[PDB]
Design a protein around this ligand. Sequence first.
Ligand SMILES: [Mn+2]
Ligand SMILES: [Mn+2]
Length: 363
Amino acid sequence: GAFLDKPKMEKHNAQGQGNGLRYGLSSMQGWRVEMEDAHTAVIGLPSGLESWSFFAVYDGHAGSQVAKYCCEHLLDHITNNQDFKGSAGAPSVENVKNGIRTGFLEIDEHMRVMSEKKHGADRSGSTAVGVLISPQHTYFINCGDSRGLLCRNRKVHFFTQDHKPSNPLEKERIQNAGGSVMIQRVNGSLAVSRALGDFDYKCVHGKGPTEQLVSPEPEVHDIERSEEDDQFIILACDGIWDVMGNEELCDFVRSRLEVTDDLEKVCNEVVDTCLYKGSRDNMSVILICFPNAPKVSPEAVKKEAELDKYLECRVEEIIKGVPDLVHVMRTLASENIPSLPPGGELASKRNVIEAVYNRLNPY
Ligand SMILES: [Mn+2]
Ligand SMILES: [Mn+2]
């Protein structure tokens, strides 16, 4: 358990386009000593799933080994089993849902034998959250306390339910496998009830793979796609959700998209806003936009430039000792400034305020 002295605020990004989609992503180490988040983003899938896409965020714990194996290999474990393939034609919803379950259980066991065989020292685990997108369905996948959501028609249409040890059915499984839930933790240690890896928590005799202290079983939800109404999907680790809620972030992302179509930038902005809202964890966001995502608006761009200029003049005037940035931020908050981004608040404007502060007080 250690934090860095100062956060590693450096961004790792990707982006792409195809199958009517556009995506951006951003990942940042932040205040933590290691980076244990991993991701997947592929448009167009092997073996005849050209018109399919896959996006996933993995939040690694006690190492990045499991998360990194998952990020390169969960997809083929899901599509390359007989449950997914199943029926001779195009996979049915059940084939897809079963294929994913099997993919999760098989990669877990696969990693377990690799660890046993090679005498592996790490005792890592990882959450997974993602979407498999077909031409007519969005299949949400969740295992752990990473979270995904769908914005349809300017609202949160669906979000994944985090697997927390104290959730009634999780708690039950844990207690049946000989453990307990202490406050929010499996036996007072583990803050998640579902994950890949964590093999010390999967050693209960007389219980199946999905009946252990920690379960690798995913939750899958089929959502019929809507060309008219579907706007965007957000996937992120708990380093994001710990400080922003579903409605807030969805409102925030909308506001950003009305100013840029640069999706990596929107994602940088989310991650930075979350660092400034007090998040001290690793942060990873993926943003998948559909054709009817919010568009850039001439007024929105202007309003934002007006706000930027306004905050610059406020910083200049506040500086007139010389107040430090913490004190400038404090003064600005107490002003109750109108028209700040929804959900992002003053935190979402810190880079603009600090750039100004740095121009006036560079030493
Ligand atoms: Mn982690
Ligand atoms: Mn985390």
